[PDB]
Write a protein of this length. Structure first.
Lengths: 144, 206, 205
């Protein structure tokens, strides 16, 4: 799944990337714009952002004017948006063609739902949700 | 001649209850040394057999004293004092007098004892995509029946049916049968059982 | 303490040779007469043969069905008992055992699943079970060899699940029928480990 996802996604760089910052959800979510969305809220004051280029680079530059941990991700690729959602074959189902969901076992934790789930959704649909919806990691940590 | 060794080949035994399995020996296995020459073997389902009782009465070491044993010149009796959820398997009445030992005997189906249930005769016509795939397998499923003393008929006759009967589970303690009728293309265009759970045959077709 | 662990399983065609070794540890190997037992799947045991102790010397006595086909040897310094299979055929598809005595099989090896089948390794023909009006199942016909696990709702439903045993056809293939019994639209998945043929299935009446 991860190998094929990376293989197919290696073409989209040059259009957009992703960034990870520790900025309070409220402010960043107020000032996002021009094809920029919060990919993953990892806390009340830590959010991961997936937006288009020339402003997501300036989103971290919007985080160096406030002097916070600035890391322009050299692994920038496309996720949690529609530029990746267009391919419904290679990046939606060709990643995982085989899957064997487990029962309760020890409670794992998913994020895109924001709550604990059974391990029946862990398949190519989960990666489709990761590339389509947000992550809501903060709600996941609160539920944990 | 060969001594015919035959035990009641089925012993429905329930946990906490004393049972007793006997054996036929057509000839006399009480040898001149004063010791019987018969062996009691238990093949644990999914594991190797175990030596329970040798020389007719002498128990082996390692196995619990539950397996007590005795017998006459011909008639033998393994006095299983008590059965648990572990004591369920196949008991072999093996004579050790005239080597070779090719035949171990059919074996005794020792089963967790419970009252008689109603076999759920479930006729299942084969899927049509199988019929366009080149084969046909109608299955007459039997579920939750005990004891397992029924075979499924195939009328309207039989001869193409194979058996896939499962083992005994724990909390339900029943059996399940799979009469698979492998078939061919043209002959596609009924199953009944004679289990002691009922008396009249139940006839349901595809 | 005593162990008689075995080795030498595999998949063969009728007419070739196979290896079976009985590892001896914990005792004097030359005292007891090593014997070999064959257990047909799900039904009665059949005895193969034994070799007498070299202190006894004696001979190697075999079953009437394996005259001129199987031979048995023994050695003390390296302490391995041998069951040599030559000119194998269909009946030899069974789990063989290594027993500790010619007349007193007091010990019992764990069992090596020796399979002599003419089939080849390929995925199963998963064929469903449309309910009459009830229980829902899915046959797993035409598969080989026999590692297999069939779950329902992808390992979510466990009550009423009956993983029926292997079904031996004349073509050397296998068939399994896992069926659940519950009133209702269920998922059954079969995973054949050797071939990686992972089939998911939706069933309706």
């Amino acid at each position: 799944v991860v190998a094929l996802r990376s293989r197919v996604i290696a073409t989209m760089p040059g259009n957009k990337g992703m960034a990870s910052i520790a900025a309070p959800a409220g402010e960043v979510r107020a000032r996002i714009g021009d094809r920029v969305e919060i990919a993953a809220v990892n806390g009340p004051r830590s959010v991961v952002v997936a937006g288009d280029s020339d402003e997501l680079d300036r989103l971290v530059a919007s985080c160096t004017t406030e002097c916070i941990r600035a890391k322009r991700l050299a692994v920038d690729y496309a996720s949690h948006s529609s530029h990746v959602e267009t391919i419904r074959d290679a990046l939606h189902a060709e990643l995982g063609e085989d899957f064997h969901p487990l029962p309760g076992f020890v409670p794992f934790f998913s994020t895109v739902t924001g709550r604990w789930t059974q391990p029946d959704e862990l398949d190519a649909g989960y990666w489709y949700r990761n590339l389509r919806r947000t992550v809501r990691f903060a709600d996941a940590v609160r539920a944990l | 001649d060969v001594v015919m060794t035959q035990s009641p080949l089925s012993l429905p035994v329930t946990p906490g209850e004393p049972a007793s399995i006997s054996c036929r020996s057509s000839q006399s296995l009480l040898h001149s040394n004063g010791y019987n020459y018969l062996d009691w073997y238990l093949q644990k389902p999914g594991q190797s057999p175990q030596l329970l009782i040798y020389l007719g009465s002498n128990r082996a070491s390692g196995v619990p004293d539950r397996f007590s044993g005795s017998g006459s010149g011909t008639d033998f009796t393994l006095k299983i004092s008590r059965v648990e959820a572990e004591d369920v398997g196949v008991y072999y009445c093996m004579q050790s007098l005239q080597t070779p030992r090719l035949t171990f005997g059919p074996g005794t189906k020792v089963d967790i004892k419970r009252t008689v249930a109603a076999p759920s005769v479930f006729i299942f016509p084969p899927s049509d995509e199988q019929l366009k795939s080149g084969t046909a397998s109608v299955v007459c499923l039997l579920n939750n029946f005990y004891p397992r003393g029924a075979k499924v008929q195939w009328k309207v006759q039989s001869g193409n049916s194979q058996e896939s009967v499962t083992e005994q589970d724990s909390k339900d303690s029943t059996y399940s049968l799979s009469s698979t009728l492998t078939l061919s293309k043209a002959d596609y265009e009924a199953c009944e059982v004679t289990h002691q759970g009922l008396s009249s045959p139940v006839t349901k077709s595809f | 303490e005593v162990q008689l662990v075995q080795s030498g399983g595999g998949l063969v065609q009728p007419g070739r040779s196979l290896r079976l070794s009985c590892t001896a540890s914990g005792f004097t190997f030359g005292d007891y007469a090593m014997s070999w037992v064959r257990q047909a799947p799900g039904k009665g045991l059949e005895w193969v043969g034994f070799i007498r102790s070299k202190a006894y010397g004696g001979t190697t006595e075999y079953a009437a069905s394996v005259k001129g086909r199987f031979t048995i040897s023994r050695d003390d310094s390296k302490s391995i008992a041998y069951l040599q299979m030559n000119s194998l055929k269909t009946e030899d598809t069974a789990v063989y055992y290594c027993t500790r005595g010619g007349t007193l099989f007091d010990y019992w090896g764990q069992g090596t699943l020796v399979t002599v089948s003419s089939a080849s390794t390929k995925g199963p023909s998963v064929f469903p079970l449309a309910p009459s009006s009830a229980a829902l199942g899915c046959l797993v016909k035409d598969y080989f060899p026999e590692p297999v696990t069939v779950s329902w709702n992808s390992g979510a439903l466990t009550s009423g699940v009956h993983t029926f045993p292997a079904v031996l056809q004349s073509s050397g293939l296998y068939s399994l029928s896992s069926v659940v019994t519950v009133p209702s639209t269920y998922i059954c998945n079969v995973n054949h480990k050797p071939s990686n043929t992972k089939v998911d299935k939706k069933v309706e009446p």
